[PDB]
Design a protein around this ligand. Structure first.
Ligand SMILES: O=c1ccn([C@@H]2O[C@H](COP(=O)(O)OP(=O)(O)OP(=O)(O)O)[C@@H](O)[C@H]2O)c(=O)[nH]1
Length: 384
């Protein structure tokens, strides 16, 4: 009798889902030990092995089950050489030995994937966590650190919001990279852009990177100073109150992307709503800078390894083409990675747009229009 309580229960259920997903107290020790295990494998396969984690276990937007992204570097590694045939060949020799050593040390389901960009995938033989190892994923490491810094501002606020977006995204196949929809990183970035638009995160409008990209120190510096509205100071000890703030943000998120004009606009944390064509210009500038430095490093390698010379213009051209095809401004979605201007949304196929748009429609309808009918198990119902 005017006694509907759907919204209250939905907020309660969603904050409980968040709380249930959080890694236990000792999880940082678990992940640290995982890093050491992988380093042990690394030290067998390559000289001066160095292992960096990235992805959600670094950002902190994770569950204890979240997979692990790992970046392997070595003596005289250069981020600028990947693409050069001879060095790609060498990186394959490193990953081939890495895969064998990982099997020997007791990693399960080890799969070495031979390619110009080689990767080794496996299930950790201690935790069961799925691991992805690649050489010198410098962008990955850097953007994960920025995301970590963002979360640090108010971990449970940003944490719950992102968690629920992802949980929804996965259930509804909006986050399904193998089905040609979004990956988690791309939707995370999207969700954060809404927070920026709401004044709940600063805009990173001053990238100072050598190639015009946003750096970790750029981000940390802005966030150090950033203030949330004063009300947020009373939300740290009560999930009913905090859940009202996260609920409002989820509403805004759903509505934002059910309505966002992607024909004109991109998603960016550096410049929210920046036009596709301006992103194009930024990309073109970025690629000139990248190309100059790339060629310079290719020459430096050849000077030290003459039998790999002379510089192969065809291969160098192909490498630059690969940089270009990573940053298209005309794909169904353009979601900008702030550390390298890569379009991380580029793989989403035109035929998938309907499903993505429809799921955002459904989410908006449920969170806003049919608020009185809210049921957590319905909103986050697994697709099919
Ligand atoms: O398009 C991409 C995808 C991924 N990445 C880089 O790889 C990392 C992992 O990419 P994921 O999409 O797995 O991000 P995640 O760890 O936040 O997702 P969950 O596993 O929790 O579902 C990200 O943190 C980013 O550094 C990109 O740079 N671009």
């Amino acid at each position: 009798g005017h006694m509907n309580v759907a919204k209250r229960e939905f907020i309660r259920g969603m904050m409980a889902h968040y709380r249930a997903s959080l890694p236990p107290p000792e999880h940082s020790v678990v992940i640290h030990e995982l890093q050491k295990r992988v380093l042990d494998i690394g030290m067998l396969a390559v000289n001066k092995a160095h292992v960096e984690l990235f992805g959600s276990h670094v950002s902190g937007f994770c569950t204890p089950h979240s997979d692990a992204d790992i970046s392997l570097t070595y003596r005289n590694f250069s981020p600028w050489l990947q693409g050069m045939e001879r060095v790609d060949e060498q990186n394959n020799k490193r990953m081939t030995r890495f895969g064998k050593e990982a099997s020997a040390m007791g990693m399960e389901d080890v799969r070495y994937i031979r390619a110009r960009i080689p990767v080794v995938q496996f299930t950790d033989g201690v935790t069961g966590i799925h691991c992805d190892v690649s050489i010198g994923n410098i962008g990955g490491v850097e953007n994960s650190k920025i995301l970590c810094a963002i979360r640090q501002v108010f971990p449970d606020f940003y944490g719950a919001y992102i968690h629920l977006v992802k949980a929804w995204g996965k259930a509804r196949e909006v986050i399904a990279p193998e089905r040609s929809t979004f990956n988690s990183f791309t939707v995370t970035t999207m969700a954060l852009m809404v927070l920026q638009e709401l004044g709940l995160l600063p805009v990173f409008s001053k990238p100072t990177g050598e190639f015009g990209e946003l750096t970790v120190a750029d981000a940390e510096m802005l966030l150090q100073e950033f203030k949330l509205p004063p009300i947020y100071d009373s939300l740290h000890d009560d999930d009913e109150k905090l859940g009202e703030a996260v609920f409002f943000c989820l509403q805004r998120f759903a509505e934002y992307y059910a309505k966002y004009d992607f024909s004109a606009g991109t998603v960016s944390l550096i410049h929210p709503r920046r036009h596709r064509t301006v992103y194009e210009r930024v990309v073109r500038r970025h690629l000139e800078l990248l190309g100059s430095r790339k060629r310079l490093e290719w020459e430096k390698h050849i000077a030290e390894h003459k039998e790999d010379g002379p510089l192969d213009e065809n291969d160098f051209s192909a490498s630059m083409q690969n940089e270009t095809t990573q940053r298209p401004s005309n794909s169904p979605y353009v979601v900008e990675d702030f550390v390298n201007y890569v379009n991380c949304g580029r793989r989403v196929q035109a035929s998938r747009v309907r499903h993505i748009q429809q799921e955002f429609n459904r989410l908006r309808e449920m969170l806003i229009d049919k608020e009185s009918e809210l049921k957590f198990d319905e909103v986050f119902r697994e697709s099919d």
